[PDB]
Design a protein around this ligand. Structure first.
Ligand code: B4Y
Ligand code: B4Y
Lengths: 395, 365
């Protein structure tokens, strides 16, 4: 009684806990979803449980956060397992960006663990470099992530809408460096650094948005991965080389992607662009001969040096000896801003916003996903809702 | 509905001890899920393996933290029922003395009885009456259901009737205490259906308290719902009047020594109850009350029972009856005195044997 009890109360209250109040309700909720089928109901035990808990769980479902509580303005983005839509909470009238993740497409493949790091990072980062997660909830079909809306859009949109000069390229590269260092200080390697993940707020300042590929570093700041992760153009040779045996890499791989970002910002095209996706693979592996710069150059000596310093073999890459090695590069030596007060200074592009639901910085995309597949009626207990138990979070 | 009213209502649902979805009941679900899924055949499923790898360790941590059978030192077995036993226990940490009731989950699953304990749990835990044996803690493991209740050192009325030739002065007291005790159960919206001296327990003071509530049933619309105390209407819909029949059966056995329908053959008893007009064979008002309950009294209310000439006495009053001196006050030497007490298969697929027990865990305060 005195020896142990105090610890149990903390485990139920703690937001970082795996067995807190909201996570335990997820278990009861998942159990009802996975058992309520005629074939399964034949079992006296399964029928005994559902007859006692179906009515109260339906009462729970109505009380706790649901997709119905949010009014969808428009679809602003789309990923592999879902879509990002601009939403307004019906009661509070607060504007958010809601990320949906298809439980079907997640179960169909095997990806049912990637969201845990993303959820943890966004919800407990408390950094102006990470897109904040206010609420996380779920139903039988999706995983919902209620995050802060970034009205300035992504860097892909900025690079297509503007001929980015070196003064702007210096700002956005430095912001990415400080943003990645915040992720590194949290003990993570991003593994998917690209302009699609770099989002801008109402002020026009950078924030990292997707953390699905994030992996916790060991005591040596290293990681072991048998399967390569990222995007064909921004992938580093060491991560691209991943296979069962030699898949050993640290935080240096994220700095490669920074150089890939800087090249695309100043040139207009990705450094290892090929018309065939296999052609890109060979170009990255042969960076010693593939990395060229167009004959016409308005871009500085120090810009090409930082690009080439990042775009080298893992061992000779810049940033191997910490972030201070990057911060001290001649390319970042300017007069307009300082490393410690960079986010406090005026951004190059400040979004001209008319309303709280302004989507000018987001390109229109096909709203209809057709007809999404739903799990077939099981003949026995499969428990498709089990890998999602504990996802619900509140702030 | 809505915000923050829906959040407020949710917070109450998690804190409320009477709630089916409170903190302690939700942990039972997660705990049952681990017990029912952790098997090699079931672990083959990627989803079942994903859940177990993520929650097995923390659930083991919770099992150690939460109340368990190991926390109690068993003094001796004081009783035994169909699906378990009642044992006198001492909590290892607090050193507090209780009476612990065990209920075999295997025996409960083997038959079909997996709902009878819910009424008993609800009554004992939320009665807050000096007529009901209080339930302090309710917990469970993969094998049993545990009920940590208050110890009744005076024993049962069966032991009293065998150890004493109960006079009318004593019979008047114990019958009246049963009446007030049953009225408390009725006011809670429950029908006992098995009122017998085996269920009537006495405290350190020597005052009555109802104990076994396995046979209880919650009232429907307004007030509608093993041997020998059974009424003809139950034996073959009825109200609270069936419990009053058993009161008369108790009073007859207290004064005569034998039950009014006692038969050498158990089938003979069944026929005797149905023919109570001819089967029913030392005071005038005592016999008048036995015949009053043994009909087809208590039809309207409890006041008609209270106003009977048999209850008219000089020694006690209905409102202060439990405050007066009891006829038999137990002579107790220690806090663990027992003088008044006479001495599963590995599934090939998801069966979920722990599911009918989810929500049983309770902690008062
Ligand atoms: C292979 N395995 C191991 C896994 C590796 C990690 C991973 N991540 C996935 N992720 C997705 O399925 C997904 C769904 C919707 C949107 C987005 C992004 C990509 C397009 C925009 N976006 C995004 O998150 N935007 C966002 C985020 C935050 C705020 C705002 C705003 N305003 C916008 C991603 S699927 C998957 C498989
Ligand atoms: C057929 N169906 C529908 C169900 C009808 C209701 C029912 N009840 C059962 N009940 C049991 O299995 C059981 C287990 C242990 C003890 C006791 C009692 C019977 C002997 C004493 N006792 C008891 O509860 N004593 C008690 C209680 C409280 C405090 C103290 C003390 N001190 C002592 C009963 S099995 C069952 C089947």
């Amino acid at each position: 009684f005195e020896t142990r009890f105090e610890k149990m109360d903390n485990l139920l209250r703690d937001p970082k806990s795996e067995v807190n109040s909201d996570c335990l309700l997820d278990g009861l909720d998942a159990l009802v979803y996975d058992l309520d089928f005629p074939a399964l109901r034949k079992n006296k035990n399964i029928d005994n449980f559902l007859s006692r808990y179906k009515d109260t769980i339906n009462k729970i479902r109505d009380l706790r956060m649901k997709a119905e509580d949010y009014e969808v303005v428009k679809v602003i983005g789309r990923g592999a397992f879902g879509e990002v839509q601009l939403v307004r909470h019906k009661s509070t009238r607060k504007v958010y960006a809601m990320k949906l993740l298809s439980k079907f497409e997640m179960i169909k493949r095997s990806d049912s663990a990637f969201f845990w790091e993303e959820r943890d990072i966004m919800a407990f980062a408390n950094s102006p470099w990470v897109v904040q997660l206010f609420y996380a909830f779920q139903d039988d079909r999706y995983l919902y992530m209620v995050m802060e809306y970034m009205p300035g859009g992504d860097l892909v949109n900025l690079m297509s809408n503007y001929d980015v000069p070196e003064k702007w390229a210096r700002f956005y590269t430095a912001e990415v460096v400080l943003a990645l260092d915040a992720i590194h200080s949290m003990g993570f390697i991003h593994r998917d650094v690209k302009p699609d993940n770099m989002l801008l707020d109402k002020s026009g300042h950078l924030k990292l948005a997707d953390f699905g590929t994030c992996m916790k570093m060991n005591k040596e700041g290293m990681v072991r991965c048998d399967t390569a992760v990222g995007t064909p153009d921004y992938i580093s040779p060491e991560v691209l080389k991943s296979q069962g045996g030699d898949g050993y890499y640290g935080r240096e791989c994220d700095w490669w992607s920074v150089g890939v970002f800087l090249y695309e910002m100043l040139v207009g095209d990705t450094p290892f662009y090929a018309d065939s996706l296999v052609g890109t693979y060979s170009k990255i592996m042969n960076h010693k001969n593939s990395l060229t710069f167009p004959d016409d150059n308005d871009i500085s000596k120090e810009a090409k040096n930082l690009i080439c310093a990042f775009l080298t073999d893992r061992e000779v890459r810049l940033g191997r000896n910490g972030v201070e090695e990057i911060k001290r590069h001649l390319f970042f030596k300017n007069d307009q801003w300082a490393w410690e007060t960079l986010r406090d200074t005026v951004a190059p592009v400040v979004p001209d916003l008319s309303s709280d639901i302004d989507t000018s910085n987001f390109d229109d995309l096909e709203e209809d996903k057709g007809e999404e597949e739903t799990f077939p009626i099981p003949k026995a207990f499969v428990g498709n809702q089990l890998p999602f138990v504990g996802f619900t979070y509140y702030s």
